[PDB]
Ligand binder design. Sequence first.
Ligand SMILES: C=C(C)c1cccc(C(C)(C)NC(=O)Nc2ccc(Cl)c(O[C@H]3O[C@H](CO)[C@@H](O)[C@H]3O)c2)c1
Ligand SMILES: C=C(C)c1cccc(C(C)(C)NC(=O)Nc2ccc(Cl)c(O[C@H]3O[C@H](CO)[C@@H](O)[C@H]3O)c2)c1
Ligand SMILES: C=C(C)c1cccc(C(C)(C)NC(=O)Nc2ccc(Cl)c(O[C@H]3O[C@H](CO)[C@@H](O)[C@H]3O)c2)c1
Ligand SMILES: C=C(C)c1cccc(C(C)(C)NC(=O)Nc2ccc(Cl)c(O[C@H]3O[C@H](CO)[C@@H](O)[C@H]3O)c2)c1
Ligand SMILES: O=c1[nH]cnc2c1ncn2[C@@H]1O[C@H](COP(=O)(O)O)[C@@H](O)[C@H]1O
Ligand SMILES: O=c1[nH]cnc2c1ncn2[C@@H]1O[C@H](COP(=O)(O)O)[C@@H](O)[C@H]1O
Ligand SMILES: O=c1[nH]cnc2c1ncn2[C@@H]1O[C@H](COP(=O)(O)O)[C@@H](O)[C@H]1O
Ligand SMILES: O=c1[nH]cnc2c1ncn2[C@@H]1O[C@H](COP(=O)(O)O)[C@@H](O)[C@H]1O
Ligand SMILES: [K+]
Ligand SMILES: [K+]
Ligand SMILES: [K+]
Lengths: 342, 346, 343, 343
Amino acid sequence: ARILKTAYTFDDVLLVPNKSEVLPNEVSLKTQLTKKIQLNIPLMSASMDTVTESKMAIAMAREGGIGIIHKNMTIEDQAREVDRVKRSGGLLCGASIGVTNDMMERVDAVVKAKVDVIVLDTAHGHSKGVIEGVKRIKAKYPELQVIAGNIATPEAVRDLAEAGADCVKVGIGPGSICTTRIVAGVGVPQLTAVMDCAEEGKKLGIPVIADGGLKYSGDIVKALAAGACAAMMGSIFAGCEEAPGAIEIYQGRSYKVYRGMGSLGAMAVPEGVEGRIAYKGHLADTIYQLIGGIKSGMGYLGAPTLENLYENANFVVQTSAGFRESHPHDINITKEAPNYSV
Amino acid sequence: AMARILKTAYTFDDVLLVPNKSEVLPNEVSLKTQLTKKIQLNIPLMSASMDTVTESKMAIAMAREGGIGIIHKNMTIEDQAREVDRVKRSGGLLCGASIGVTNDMMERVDAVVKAKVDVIVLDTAHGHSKGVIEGVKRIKAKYPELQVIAGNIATPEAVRDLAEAGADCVKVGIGPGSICTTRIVAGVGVPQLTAVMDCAEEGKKLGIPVIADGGLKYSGDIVKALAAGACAAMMGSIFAGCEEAPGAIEIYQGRSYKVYRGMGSLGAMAKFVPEGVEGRIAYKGHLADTIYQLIGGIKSGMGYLGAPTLENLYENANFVVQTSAGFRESHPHDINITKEAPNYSV
Amino acid sequence: ARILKTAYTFDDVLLVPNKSEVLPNEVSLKTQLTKKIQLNIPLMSASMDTVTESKMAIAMAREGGIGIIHKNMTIEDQAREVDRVKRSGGLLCGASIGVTNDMMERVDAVVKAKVDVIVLDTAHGHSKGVIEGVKRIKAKYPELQVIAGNIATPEAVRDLAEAGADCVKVGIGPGSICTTRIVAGVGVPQLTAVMDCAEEGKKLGIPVIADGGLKYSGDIVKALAAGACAAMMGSIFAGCEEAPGAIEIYQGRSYKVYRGMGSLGAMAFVPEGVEGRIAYKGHLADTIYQLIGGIKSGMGYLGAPTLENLYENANFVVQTSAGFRESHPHDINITKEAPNYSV
Amino acid sequence: ARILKTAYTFDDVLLVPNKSEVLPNEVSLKTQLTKKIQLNIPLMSASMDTVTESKMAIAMAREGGIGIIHKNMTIEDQAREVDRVKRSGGLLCGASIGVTNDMMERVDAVVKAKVDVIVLDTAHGHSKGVIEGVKRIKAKYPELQVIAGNIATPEAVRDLAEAGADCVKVGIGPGSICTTRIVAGVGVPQLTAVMDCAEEGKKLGIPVIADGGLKYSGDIVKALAAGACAAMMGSIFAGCEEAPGAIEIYQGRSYKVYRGMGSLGAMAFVPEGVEGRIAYKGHLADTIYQLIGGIKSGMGYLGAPTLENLYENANFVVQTSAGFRESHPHDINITKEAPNYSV
Ligand SMILES: C=C(C)c1cccc(C(C)(C)NC(=O)Nc2ccc(Cl)c(O[C@H]3O[C@H](CO)[C@@H](O)[C@H]3O)c2)c1
Ligand SMILES: C=C(C)c1cccc(C(C)(C)NC(=O)Nc2ccc(Cl)c(O[C@H]3O[C@H](CO)[C@@H](O)[C@H]3O)c2)c1
Ligand SMILES: C=C(C)c1cccc(C(C)(C)NC(=O)Nc2ccc(Cl)c(O[C@H]3O[C@H](CO)[C@@H](O)[C@H]3O)c2)c1
Ligand SMILES: C=C(C)c1cccc(C(C)(C)NC(=O)Nc2ccc(Cl)c(O[C@H]3O[C@H](CO)[C@@H](O)[C@H]3O)c2)c1
Ligand SMILES: O=c1[nH]cnc2c1ncn2[C@@H]1O[C@H](COP(=O)(O)O)[C@@H](O)[C@H]1O
Ligand SMILES: O=c1[nH]cnc2c1ncn2[C@@H]1O[C@H](COP(=O)(O)O)[C@@H](O)[C@H]1O
Ligand SMILES: O=c1[nH]cnc2c1ncn2[C@@H]1O[C@H](COP(=O)(O)O)[C@@H](O)[C@H]1O
Ligand SMILES: O=c1[nH]cnc2c1ncn2[C@@H]1O[C@H](COP(=O)(O)O)[C@@H](O)[C@H]1O
Ligand SMILES: [K+]
Ligand SMILES: [K+]
Ligand SMILES: [K+]
């Protein structure tokens, strides 16, 4: 039983600027989610019953990303949801699958609805059940694109790619609503997890998704510079108008419900919590700020594409003092900024 | 010889366990552990020997759940014997008794032995001392088969010296306790994760187990202590609010509290300078409900690490260090929690 | 994509005392801003529309420093502001230029008004547009002093010096109103940025400016010890009577507006700064006095009669968060105002 | 410019327990302040106008420690305070001296009043003025015990010893009222400073004093285990009945005034201390009882029956801020007062 190293999250690191011949308006955000699936922007919405149904997925895809329909619903309803996204323009769409008895039955129905990718998502992706589930899926549907998660190690990338996954999803414990690391003691701070896993995926030719723990646009730049093909978010999108759930008002402020899929409410021992986040308005305005920040970061790094970003990215580690310097400090902020908050 | 800085030492909140390949489900794992070579526990949990934590009611409840309680010694010799006696006659449950380094030490041990106590815990502020080492030797001479836990310690050298004195198990923890001020008033101690790991390593070489005593707040902390090599975890704070702990239920402004205090606090010693504090913690209802959450957390952690057994968990556990920013990410963040979780509190 | 090292900001480090044969009242604060421009004190006011117009630049220069007139104005008005400064005595003045379609005509205007230095300043100075800008300016006005920024790597120092910069300005992300590091993920903790850049500039013969993130006089000492020729500040000066903006009273205290140049309000669409209020400080002279006294104190502690000697002989140690807590006052209820400390 | 290392303060480290054969009550706390001055306990009260006059110095002496009479009075009044302590019986007394034009005058007076040790104390002890001052005092009074400070490096230990000091005082910037590190940028976290200076002093046979930054009895154990012959405290004693100043009441709480001597108030150029108020803590003997109890407890944990053995067998580990949270009480609503713990 040994200590391997210090592992870092997004707030621990910064990207060093490079020489740049490209302006933020000239960079391309295109990325391959699998070898067969290109996104126009590297963003995905979490498959949670408070984040992504057909309305969110349609909106994500029109912006050039993708939404993964959650599976806290009957098989027929999830099929319906996928079908509505597919009929709204041949937009891309995903569907969540669990390691369950009816797993193949749920897969058959979202395939019938012509889902583009299934996400075999589970608390612990580096497990025999997930490995065998991927092998059953790829044996019946060899061309069906499969994302498997969640994981946090190069060995997990290796075993899941060996099983036939086309993409793997990284993140054990970083979610805003997640208590996995506290109740089970397990996880890897997300920037080191993505860096280590994406480096392994690149050697195998399998992309990785940086899933969870993202709070600012600059976090996504770091996830992409570390080598993730795409970034998945629940918190950043669950307050948008297109997220499921009504808008609630409490003492002058408008909120939407957001909860972990492993919380008591979502399941009705838990590994998530349930709560409220601020109402953000329409997805478009959030995406515009996220993409603007990504384009700026890429301008700072001289990267015209996502791959060039990864190839020339150098991180430095900052201390808690450096974190205090990186945020605004020693000012009473009195005007809303659209891409910042405390 | 000169003073030196050895290394950085870590507490539970500093580290995370890296997930392994798993072929085991949380409900398939076994929590059986050897507290000593002759005492098996069904779950690796112990309740602390404090006068706000463990008497008969608590020890009975702990044994029923598969753990064990250590009856505290802020008690006449006779009362402690009767406390042990009630646990033994309550269905043959395991029971332990706390013993200090006192002039009547052997008279206290005699009485709990007669009450058929299964283990005695010679616990004191500084276990790595001549008084403790001579006391273990005296007990193992009069009672060669009596199981003896000695503590508290924090170094591998202390494991060896107490193992050579004849201890069957050593208890690790100088300063991690919720109510403890040792490190602040005396400047002494070792962050608990590193203390458990370095002592467990030495104990494994010698074949003596180590207990991780103090500083546990969440079920995931227990997983880290077991993964660092402890055979069992000892908790005061987590159990002091349970209905089975001593003390009445106090209500102040809509919340329910129970008293919890260090054995080295002024109040506990009136019943020197103090090395503990006195206060209140939340009432938690029945012990069974807390243990359920603890065991569930432990089983989930073993599932993530691919460990069907506690020895497999130690053999394959890998830790990473996280910063304070990583700690912020590990807890729920950027959310207004509006519903209680039964295993997470703020 | 890899991790280079840990990088430090000012609060991460402390300077070790040296043997001293000099009293703080004997040190000299002269610095070469460029080869041609000497300042009597190594302080600059930021080129921001809530910090430096002519009033601020005139006071900074009378105190021995310099102000950089911001460019959130028409070309004509910026020339008029520089001209106000030059007509108010022998006063040094600077003017901010950006990478814009009308860049050279803005430079022509400020040159005609007799500006002493232009600051070609933009979010990312290590860029082809800044490099081409410096070359174009130097090709037309070979003797005009050019500061280029902002940057944070030794490679950018070398490229901007090769382009013909006379001085480079270091700082990506540290400013009190800046969100660059949060929104784009990019920056270098400022003490390490200044140290690594100044060392490259020393080898090349080009000075560097420590711009941004400075809060106390001690911070400036650390910036200068790390090799910067001068320190540039916005927050420390924006609350002064000579900065732009009225004085606002609210619940018994006095405030002034301070905002990033990349905030929505300054720009009037993804901002890299915020907008807010800071305490009114009174006259520039009194803040400068405290700054100077603290710098002179630090040079006393390090035995430095000059700023070059301070840099040549300074050693740092890293402190933890607990060391930070010990470095500030602690375990006291402060009941009297200190003119050079506040919580 | 170069970063030498990470430097640590008391909150950054913990001492590893040793095998012990000694109970706390059996421990001996005697120490050599200098080769010719023994204290029954290794505690000194700071030479500050809010901590030690004769009332404090006499009380420190009766407890086994010693007070340094502060210098913020006339030469005549300081000798009177020294004389009053020395006529109260066989009590030890120190007196503070500065690098002043009347330095020798003030030394003459306190020497006439039979002071036992002088403390040539200044902001920056590793300076020509202090080195010359020690040399002049020792050339006139070869047997006067001289403590010189304040310093933070082994080079300063060596330079001050070669000048004739009998003890050196370590501490640049750790004091609770101190702002040296914020306003001048200079200092060394105190545990590292004591350890590095104590190691040099032991090679030379000259003791060091750990001055400032101590909050709990456990911090003093760390400073002695790090090599100091004694610990000097202002904040821990300024709330005691024997400190100067009246007991002031506000909302049912009792306070005393405490201020740095580089604060504006004490100086009545640029300040390096703050002014404020701390809790009233009653008679000094109550506080000393708790300090000595905690020290004896720590030496029990370290198997040190006496103090010389302590440094030789002291092993520190570094703790993170998470370890710091574990070291204090946590997850408890403390409802009873503890005599040796507060937050
Ligand atoms: C996103 C989160 C956190 C999550 C989402 C929904 C529910 C949960 C709950 C609260 C139910 N918690 C677990 O489910 N915890 C868990 C822990 C360890 C293991 Cl080993 C495990 O099972 C693995 O093996 C199975 C077969 O491959 C497959 O279920 C896989 O997860 C599950 C967590
Ligand atoms: C002080 C700050 C932060 C600042 C000040 C004013 C405005 C901005 C705004 C909000 C407009 N943000 C950027 O402007 N962000 C940005 C990011 C990356 C690049 Cl690559 C970039 O462009 C570089 O290339 C161009 C040609 O050299 C030149 O404009 C140069 O800055 C600009 C920031
Ligand atoms: C859980 C805690 C902290 C604790 C629990 C109850 C009481 C105490 C008190 C406040 C009384 N504090 C000590 O007791 N402090 C102490 C410190 C150093 C030594 Cl060396 C020491 O004595 C050792 O040597 C003796 C013979 O082996 C034996 O008493 C052993 O403890 C005791 C602490
Ligand atoms: C405890 C503190 C902080 C302290 C105590 C009282 C007064 C001061 C004031 C506020 C006046 N601040 C300094 O005095 N600051 C200072 C800074 C650098 C140097 Cl180099 C210096 O003077 C050195 O050179 C002289 C010749 O020996 C000698 O006086 C020595 O101190 C003094 C500080
Ligand atoms: O309750 C749960 N426990 C742990 N992780 C969860 C839970 N529910 C969702 N997640 C993960 O957390 C991510 C959202 O993280 P966020 O973007 O920080 O809010 C999802 O994409 C899932 O990977
Ligand atoms: O007063 C004391 N001072 C220091 N440690 C104590 C004191 N009383 C009990 N302990 C220890 O603290 C443990 C409880 O830690 P907790 O589970 O963090 O509350 C006990 O099992 C003892 O090992
Ligand atoms: O909005 C902006 N975003 C990022 N940096 C800015 C912005 N506006 C001004 N700056 C920089 O911040 C410095 C002021 O930093 P301060 O002294 O910490 O307030 C200026 O000199 C500029 O270098
Ligand atoms: O104002 C000052 N500036 C810096 N240090 C001071 C000042 N006044 C007193 N000191 C130091 O601080 C010590 C007191 O530290 P305290 O015990 O932390 O309050 C004194 O013994 C002096 O060494
Ligand atoms: K900033
Ligand atoms: K989390
Ligand atoms: K201080």
